[PDB]
């Protein structure tokens, strides 16, 4: 009792116990239970970090200040430490000697109250080895008779499983559900606690920063609850301000500082959290358009969806954007995705849907490894979005995917949040969703089997309607078709590849003078209607880089470049100039 | 205070090596130590990474004064678990000592208790303790506690409990980069050199870090680097009695690593040019069969090591096929023996069940700590620089083949455990017996037809077309020749002759017997596998029986021959 119990009332006089802000309903229910003739033992059941221990400690603080009824005045709260009580016993009755002595003290003082945080531990044998003489059994007669008043704090899961098993002890305690009040009430709570934290770090927190902390924490720090998470970011912000600046630097904690702290906790790049991306958004459409030629309606659709979400017009609960890319292979479907990711700077997550074809493999994306194995694994999709809140999810050959996969995406697009089988809540509202399918290209490219060529303009949409359920299509923002690359745009594609090679050669010092006529011949072989531009990679490297590269390493001309290329009608080959 | 040792006072008197690097990790600890709540930091790092030393660095900063004024007057202490557990003999006596020290620390403010190997004191663990007093000091916030715990035993002790995790902040302490590690040695070079007055060349210190991670593969390179350096310096100090070789070279460091590795000095030494140059010669010496395959395979290895400008992909992806036991496995084991690497063996026939596929990349039954994990993935992590042997690849489930494509193309594998493997150095080899099976079957016709088929077409039926393009070169074994099998019989009997030499009895075998044993033992369908059974039961049974009870108890002098009419071996013994 000398060291196991710390008088909270005495402690509050000096300090330590932080003020409790806005828990009248909770305290009123507790004061009512404490006033009961029998079984006047409150229990505080709530999730982690939701102010369970602040109410008990806060009650002592409120008593000292006279904010409680007269019946509760002249009341002392004692905070029993179970670990101290179970340390140093090393004997048959050392635990019972000290524990019973504590009860005698409480019995002597009618108004004394015992606060036992993490009360689930008493059910566990305190000092009982192969015996049932536990702490809980010893206090069961006293709680029933109202001799002592006990306040306990334990989590819902611990309360449901560890507690409530012994219906005897559970009966004495009166469950009081302690839930997080709101995103807005937490701001008021931090205001009350702000002076203590400000004094510790000798800094002042701006009004905008405190509100930003709560709001930024909810978006990214989802593992913990609102009161603790907001305070933790605030605490870390002051500490960084103490160590980072040497001296005579801004003491005030700016809003940008809060974003840096929350970014490291969430391992975010710290660029997405900030709203300084307006400059990139200004010319995002034009910049992306020059990077990939043709299919302009796709880049504008992507930029418009991102631009609206960053302007306050984004969906409240749905993702930033859901899109389906229906077009021939190698028409820039994956190009707009990767180039968008690079310009924005966010990651590009890619998942091959050909792998997830059977029913047994659908669980992988939204389930932990088979059985109950693997540590920080979760669903394959869930850990990627949790790891990167702002990213670009890419799915290729979605049509091949099992029907059960589409059912998973329905809640994603409709609600914007995905819950893994493990139990964690994955919230990915910033990630844009893009799917690439080749369903319609097959029907449009193939001609009708008949003397008359039937109209295939509407045939492509018909396949998508039957292949994709109406519910799935309704959630999608828009369906964009990637059209075959015309000869005009095809010239731009070869220009990009050859210019790219020129840049690489420029550092080496080699120069090229490829003719415009050579571009036309390269385009026909490089681009195929069925395979698109995927074979074009080899044509540029093999026709241009490989002959010259071999000569560069060992050839007639060791170095000096000044190479030229021209089409050869008879040989259909490219000329190579060797000027030292 | 007697149990613990003040690191802050220790720095004043010296004996603490100047920390180099980990500026970000060190700065992180100071930031959390200045927190109003949850100030207690944690150091999640593997053994040898340098988690204990980074805490020592903080004490040096305080003495140096390059920290805020809040921590300038602070002190740090190191809990000695051994001192507390010294002679108590009862659980609870230990706790009393801990409480007394806490009160001594509590009276004086700005005191930090660095608990090294915190995992041992808290939690039940696997291989004692109470853990009752660690919780109140954390909740009281009076004295900050720095706890060093390994990655393993941290998920089963800290993540499982909210109280400890809530009050502790996790600091990921990864191993330093090779460039960073060599810089540390330069920082620590004046202290080691002053002990024995030897000068280390820049090449030797850089080589030690590079070679240590490649060969030891036991603990992290920072601890390994200091060990080989100190060991070489100590060895050099006293290696020559007459000569005081104050200079150091790569020759000395190579021998030191060889001793602990227990691998030949030539293999451990950075003699890749020498080993690759004589790779074929060393391999051809022991095994003289399938010279055509060896010549193609030997050249493929030298060019493979170069990488042709692509290193992310696995260096070795050669596939072997042909009749069973005709040298498919001998070359692989002999290749490893010459190199000195530890050969691994996995039979794909065994892993022909979907449940078995999970065994390779995890455990279907529930395991604690996932120590066993994947049968193959864990072994790769254990010995990355080792060859992987696969048997009966043809008889494998289709899904398994998909995983193989990722290894050669992606260059990395992800499983439930999540451990990454550097497949770049990893080599791969496979043996296919399907080809020989096609020629053994007989066609459904009145007259049989030639069953010889191109090796390329056979692979297409059993293997996906997206694998032969990514492979370097295909090697196929058609069949052995009379001259090769005959010579092999002579080599095998030598083992029996060597065995008999220790026993003290000689043996003599006629040339006719050697030729007769080759045709019967060798089988086209089964290669040379039945030859060992045929030769062993024939020769071993009669000699063993006589050696125990008979004229051959001592002396030997045996003679073997076969009558032409009988066409059966005859055994003659002389007392």
């Amino acid at each position: 009792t000398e060291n196991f119990t710390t008088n909270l009332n005495q402690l509050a006089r000096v300090g330590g116990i932080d003020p409790l802000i806005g828990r009248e309903k909770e305290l009123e229910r507790a004061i009512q239970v404490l006033c009961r003739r029998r079984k006047n033992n409150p229990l505080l059941v709530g999730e982690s970090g939701v102010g369970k221990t602040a109410i008990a400690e806060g009650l002592a603080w409120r008593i000292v200040q006279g904010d409680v009824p007269e019946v509760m005045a002249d009341c002392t709260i004692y905070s029993l430490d179970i670990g101290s009580l179970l340390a140093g016993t090393k004997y048959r009755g050392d635990f019972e000697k000290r524990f019973k002595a504590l009860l005698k003290q409480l019995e002597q003082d009618t108004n004394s109250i015992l606060f036992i945080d993490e009360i689930h531990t008493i059910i566990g044998a305190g000092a009982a080895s192969g015996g049932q003489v536990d702490a809980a059994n010893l206090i069961k007669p006293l709680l029933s008779s109202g001799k002592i008043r006990v306040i306990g704090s334990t989590t819902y899961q611990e309360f449901s499983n560890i507690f409530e098993k012994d219906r005897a002890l559970a009966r004495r305690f009166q469950k009081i559900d302690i839930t997080e009040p709101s995103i807005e009430e937490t701001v008021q709570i931090i205001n009350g606690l702000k002076p203590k934290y400000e004094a510790h770090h000798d800094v002042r927190y701006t009004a905008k920063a405190v509100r930003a902390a709560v709001e930024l924490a909810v978006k990214y720090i989802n593992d913990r609850h609102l009161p603790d998470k907001a305070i933790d970011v605030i605490d870390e912000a002051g500490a960084r301000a103490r160590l980072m600046p040497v001296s005579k630097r801004k003491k005030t904690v700016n809003v940008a500082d809060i974003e840096s702290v929350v970014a490291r906790i969430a391992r975010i790049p710290e660029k997405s959290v900030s709203q300084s991306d307006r400059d990139t958004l200004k010319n995002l459409g034009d910049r992306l358009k020059m990077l990939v030629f043709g299919q302009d309606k796709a880049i504008e659709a992507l930029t418009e969806a991102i631009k609206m979400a960053r302007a306050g017009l984004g969906h409240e609960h749905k993702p930033v954007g859901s899109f389906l890319f229906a077009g021939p292979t190698g028409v820039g479907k994956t190009e707009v995705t990767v180039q968008l990711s690079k310009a924005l700077g966010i990651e590009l997550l890619r998942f091959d849907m050909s792998e997830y074809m059977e029913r047994h493999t659908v669980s992988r994306l939204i389930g932990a490894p088979p059985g109950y194995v693997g540590f920080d694994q979760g669903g394959l999709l869930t850990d990627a979005v949790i790891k990167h809140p702002h990213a670009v999810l890419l799915l290729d050959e979605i049509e091949k995917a099992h029907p059960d996969v589409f059912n998973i995406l329905l809640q994603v697009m409709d609600n914007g949040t995905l819950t893994d089988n493990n139990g964690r809540k994955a919230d990915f509202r910033n990630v844009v969703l893009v799917m690439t399918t080749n369903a319609g290209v097959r029907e449009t490219e193939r001609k009708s089997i008949g003397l008359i060529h039937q109209d295939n303009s509407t045939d492509a949409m018909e396949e998508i309607k039957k292949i994709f359920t109406p519910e799935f299509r309704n959630r999608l923002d828009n369906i964009i078709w990637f059209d075959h690359l015309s000869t005009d745009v095809i010239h731009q594609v070869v220009d990009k590849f050859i210019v790219e090679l020129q840049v690489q050669l420029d550092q080496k010092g080699v120069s090229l003078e490829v003719s415009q006529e050579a571009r036309n011949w390269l385009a026909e072989k490089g681009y195929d209607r069925a395979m698109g531009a995927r074979p074009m990679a080899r044509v540029i490297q093999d026709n241009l880089k490989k002959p010259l590269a071999n000569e560069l390493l060992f050839g007639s001309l060791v170095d000096g470049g000044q190479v030229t290329v021209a089409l050869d009608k008879e040989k259909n080959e490219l000329t190579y100039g060797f000027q030292s | 205070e007697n149990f613990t040792t003040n690191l802050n006072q220790l720095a004043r008197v010296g004996g603490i090596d100047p920390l180099i690097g980990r500026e970000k990790e060190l700065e992180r600890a100071i930031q959390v130590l200045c927190r109003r709540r949850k100030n207690n930091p944690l150091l999640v790092g593997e053994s040898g990474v340098g988690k204990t030393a980074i805490a020592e660095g903080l004490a040096w900063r305080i003495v140096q004064g390059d920290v805020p004024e809040v921590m300038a007057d602070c002190t740090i202490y190191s809990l000695d678990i051994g001192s507390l557990l010294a002679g108590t003999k009862y659980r609870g006596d230990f706790e009393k000592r801990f409480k007394a020290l806490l009160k001594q620390l509590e009276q004086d403010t700005n005191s930090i208790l660095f608990i090294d190997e915190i995992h041992t004191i808290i939690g039940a663990g696997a291989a004692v303790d109470a853990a009752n007093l660690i919780k109140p000091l954390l909740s009281s916030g009076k004295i900050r506690v720095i706890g060093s715990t390994t990655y393993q035993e941290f998920s089963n002790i800290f993540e499982k409990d909210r109280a400890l995790a809530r009050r502790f902040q996790k600091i990921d302490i990864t191993e330093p980069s090779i460039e960073e590690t060599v810089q540390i040695i330069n920082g620590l070079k004046p202290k080691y050199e002053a002990h024995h007055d030897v000068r280390y060349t820049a090449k030797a210190v850089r080589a030690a870090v590079e070679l240590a991670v490649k060969y030891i593969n036991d603990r992290h390179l920072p601890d390994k680097a200091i060990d080989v350096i100190d060991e070489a310096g100590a060895r050099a100090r006293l290696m020559p009695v007459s000569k005081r070789k104050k200079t150091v070279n790569v020759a000395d460091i190579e021998s030191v690593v060889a001793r602990i590795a227990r691998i030949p000095e030539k293999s451990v030494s950075q003699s890749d040019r020498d080993t690759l140059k004589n790779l074929g010669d060393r391999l051809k010496m022991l095994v003289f069969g399938q010279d055509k395959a060896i010549e193609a395979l030997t050249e493929a290895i030298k060019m493979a090591r170069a990488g042709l400008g692509h290193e992310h992909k696995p260096v070795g992806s050669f596939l072997f096929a042909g009749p069973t036991g005709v040298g498919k496995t001998e070359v692989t084991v002999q290749l490893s023996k010459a190199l000195g690497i530890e050969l691994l063996r996995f039979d794909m026939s065994e892993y022909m069940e979907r449940h078995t596929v999970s065994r390779l990349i995890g455990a279907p039954p529930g395991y604690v700590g996932f120590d066993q994990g994947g049968l193959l993935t864990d072994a790769v992590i254990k010995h990355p620089h080792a060859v992987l042997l696969l048997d009966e690849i043809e008889k494998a489930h289709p899904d398994v083949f998909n995983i193989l494509l990722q290894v050669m193309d992606n260059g990395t594998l992800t499983d439930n455990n999540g451990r990454k493997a550097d497949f770049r150095n990893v080599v791969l080899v496979m043996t296919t017996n399907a080809g020989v099976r096609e020629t053994e079957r007989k066609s459904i016709g009145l007259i049989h037809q030639d069953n010889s088929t191109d090796a390329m077409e056979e692979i297409k039926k059993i293997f996906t077309p997206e694998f032969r393009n990514r492979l370097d070169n295909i090697i196929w074994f058609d069949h052995l020749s009379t001259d090769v099998i005959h010579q092999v019989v002579d080599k095998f009997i030598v083992e029996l002759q060597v065995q008999l030499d220790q026993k003290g009895v000689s043996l003599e075998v006629s040339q006719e017997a050697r030729n007769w044993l080759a045709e019967k033992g060798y089988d086209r369908a089964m290669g040379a596998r039945p030859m060992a059974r045929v030769i062993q039961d024939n020769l071993k049974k009669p000699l063993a029986n006589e050696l125990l009870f008979g004229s051959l108890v001592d002396g030997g002098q045996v003679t073997v021959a076969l009558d032409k009419e009988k066409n059966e071996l005859t055994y003659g013994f002389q007392s």
Binding site: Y91, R92, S129, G131 | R91, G92
Partner: peptide
Amino acid sequence: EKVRDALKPPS
């Protein structure tokens, strides 16, 4: 955990 203890007087 519960173990009996036998004492001895000084004299």
